[PDB]
């Protein structure tokens, strides 16, 4: 519906979120993913770390600069899983990937926008209670990501600014709701109540 | 997919017209073709079929 959909990556499963996003891109929808360092993967930390080390040892024998590239950033990790679900070698596939943006945290162009969630890919709604899961931000640092502290420092600053905005908005909503309740019990309100509004 | 019980597009195996190019012989075939069609007499059908035979199949009498 919206021209651009902004998805908050916190508390999502990497595989199920990527499948949802990949289908949206091929249908002409634009998707923006924020806070990629808060993504979740089912399974304990040691299992996913061992799998990544297996991926690390796959490279071209005669020249390491031609083989697979092992990106470490959480945004790039999600991009790799998403690119595997899209036929990126075709002109149609390249067009779909041009509609995708992945970020760590919430950069200033999208901090004052509305973020949505995908109930299909939510970890809390999918994994059975008591199961193990891995946070993508912690895993990336273990394999060579070097910007976990700066993201945390800037993200803490963003929450302070956003909390102040919410306090002002909450007060304004309280004032409007009080006026709306006062305006009730009138003839216009009764007529609207008869028609469901 | 059809499980044929016999050969397909098989010709009858009998002569329908004379092999020769004799104009007078073809006139007799045209005459007896009409008779064999509008007289239902077994003699006419026999004579019409016998006009198609080859030389070895028409020994002298």
């Amino acid at each position: 519906v919206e021209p651009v959909v902004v998805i908050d990556g916190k508390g999502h499963l990497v595989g199920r979120l990527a499948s949802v996003v990949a289908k949206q891109l091929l249908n002409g929808q634009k998707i923006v993913v924020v806070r990629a360092e808060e993504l979740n993967i089912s399974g304990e930390f040691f299992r996913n770390k061992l799998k990544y080390h297996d991926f690390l040892r796959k490279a071209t024998a005669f020249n390491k600069t031609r083989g697979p590239f092992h990106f470490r950033a959480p945004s790039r990790i999600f991009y790799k899983a998403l690119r595997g679900m899209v036929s990126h070698k075709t002109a149609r596939g390249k067009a779909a990937l041009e509609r995708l943006k992945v970020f760590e945290g919430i950069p200033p162009p999208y901090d004052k926008k509305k973020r949505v969630v995908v109930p299909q890919a939510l970890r809390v709604l999918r994994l059975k209670p008591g199961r193990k899961y891995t946070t993508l931000g912690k895993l990336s640092t273990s394999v060579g990501w070097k910007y976990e502290d700066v993201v945390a420092k800037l993200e803490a600053k963003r929450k302070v600014s956003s909390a102040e905005y919410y306090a002002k908005k909450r007060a304004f909503t309280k004032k409007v709701a009080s006026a709306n309740a006062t305006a009730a019990e009138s003839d216009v309100a009764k007529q609207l109540a008869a028609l469901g509004y | 997919g059809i499980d044929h019980t016999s050969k397909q597009h098989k010709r009858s195996g009998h002569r329908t017209a004379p092999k020769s190019d004799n104009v007078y012989l073809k006139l007799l075939v045209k005459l007896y073709t009409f008779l064999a069609r509008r007289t239902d007499a077994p003699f006419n059908k026999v004579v019409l079929k016998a006009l198609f035979l080859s030389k070895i199949n028409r020994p002298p009498v």
């Binding site: 519906v1 249908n27 149609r92 | -």
Partner: protein, 106 residues
């Protein structure tokens, strides 16, 4: 008012296809707001127009239209099958189409 829309928004998904063979004669159309094969029976027979722009002007206009109609439904998710006089180009996979309310049965 500020809205003059008399059609339902739609998207061109792809041609009718197998795993490795496609048929351009039939195009799959996704209609916004429909998620049930039963809800898609309303839009059967409705006219579909694909509107695009061109640099050259022919009949006093630089806008060209390809017409079509809805024939049947497709799958369990409300997708329908549409056929056009000329098949839609493959580059329009994901482009917006207009589904009008005529012929009307209301």
């Amino acid at each position: 008012a500020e809205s003059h829309r008399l059609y339902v928004k739609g998207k061109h998904l792809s041609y009718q296809r197998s795993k490795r063979v496609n048929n351009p004669n039939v195009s799959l159309i996704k209609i916004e707001g429909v998620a049930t094969p039963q809800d898609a029976q309303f839009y059967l027979g409705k006219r579909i127009a694909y509107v695009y722009r061109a640099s050259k002007e022919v009949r006093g206009s630089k806008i060209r239209v390809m017409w079509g109609k809805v024939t049947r439904t497709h799958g369990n998710s409300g997708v329908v099958r549409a056929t056009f006089r000329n098949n839609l180009p493959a580059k329009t996979f994901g482009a917006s189409v207009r589904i009008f309310l005529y012929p009307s049965n209301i």
